[PDB]
Amino acid sequence: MAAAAVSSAKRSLRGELKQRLMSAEERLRQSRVLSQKVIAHSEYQKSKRISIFLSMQDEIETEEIIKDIFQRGKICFIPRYRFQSNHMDMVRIESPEEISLLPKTSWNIPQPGEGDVREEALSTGGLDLIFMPGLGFDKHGNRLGRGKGYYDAYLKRCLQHQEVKPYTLALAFKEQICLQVPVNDMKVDEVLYED
Ligand SMILES: [Mg+2]
Ligand SMILES: [Mg+2]
Ligand SMILES: [Mg+2]
Ligand SMILES: [Mg+2]
Ligand SMILES: [Mg+2]
Ligand SMILES: [Mg+2]
Ligand SMILES: [Mg+2]
Ligand code: NI
Ligand code: NI
Ligand code: NI
Ligand code: NI
Numbered sequence: 001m002a003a004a005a006v007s008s009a010k011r012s013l014r015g016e017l018k019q020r021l022m023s024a025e026e027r028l029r030q031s032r033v034l035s036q037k038v039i040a041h042s043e044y045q046k047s048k049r050i051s052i053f054l055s056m057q058d059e060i061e062t063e064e065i066i067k068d069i070f071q072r073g074k075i076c077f078i079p080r081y082r083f084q085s086n087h088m089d090m091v092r093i094e095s096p097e098e099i100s101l102l103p104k105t106s107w108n109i110p111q112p113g114e115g116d117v118r119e120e121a122l123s124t125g126g127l128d129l130i131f132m133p134g135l136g137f138d139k140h141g142n143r144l145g146r147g148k149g150y151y152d153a154y155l156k157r158c159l160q161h162q163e164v165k166p167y168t169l170a171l172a173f174k175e176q177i178c179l180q181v182p183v184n185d186m187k188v189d190e191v192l193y194e195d
Contacts, residue, residue, distance in 0.1 A: 009182035013144055017136045020175040021058040027173070030195070031061035034171050037192050038065050043167045047129035049075045051090045051121060051166070054099065054109050059133055060171040066096050077121045080111045081150060088150040090127065091118035126158055127166040132188045137172050141188040142181040152185050 038044050050069055055061045069076045077090035083105070091112055093099060102110035112118050121127050132151060136144040145151060158166050172193040 006182050014135055030173050034060050034192055035064040039068055043129055049128045051077045051127050051130040053079055053131055053133045070096055086149050086153050088154055090121040122161050126162040129167045132168050132170040136176050136178045136181055137170050137191040138178045138181045141191060142183050143188050144181045155186050
């Protein structure tokens with residue numbers, strides 16, 4: 001019952017948030033602001049092994065950050081989701097240009113296909129820094145995802161491979177910042193956002 005009330009609150013907020021999620025140019029504008037903030041960010045600059053998402057249209061565009069990741073010689077991993085469940089791995093990509101050749105999911109997001117053998121981040125040391133996607137975030141680092149809980153489960157696996165947990169950095173539109181995100185689940189270290 002209390003569980004259902006939480007679910008209801010999340011569902012309502014998701015609706016409210018997805019409504020808010022803007023022009024194409026404003027999305028690009030705000031993505032450019034965040035990329036600069038990211039490139040200037042201490043945790044990002046120091047990170048050696050990085051997980052980053054490939055942007056949907058209701059998400060901060062990560063294209064510029066991906067270019068920079070490879071320029072800084074970081075080891076770059078992207079999501080590969082198993083849609084049958086809440087399982088995801090982070091799989092290694094070797095250049096920004098590789099992304100353009102990948103097959104795409106029903107979300108129109110690139111990820112390596114079923115027969116494509118990939119280095120999984122947890123097989124080779126884990127991650128220093130994970131960029132956290134989501135529908136909404138509050139100033140306490142509470143995250144509202146799409147409902148499937150992939151990132152929550154992934155973070156718990158990271159604990160089994162690393163003495164120190166990966167730093168988690170959320171990238172948000174101004175429109176994605178909420179007063180209170182209803183919660184059960186796992187906070188992000190920092191939410192970046194502004195005009
Ligand atoms: Mg927007
Ligand atoms: Mg976008
Ligand atoms: Mg699948
Ligand atoms: Mg997993
Ligand atoms: Mg393709
Ligand atoms: Mg697999
Ligand atoms: Mg609010
Ligand atoms: Ni992995
Ligand atoms: Ni797997
Ligand atoms: Ni998730
Ligand atoms: Ni509060």
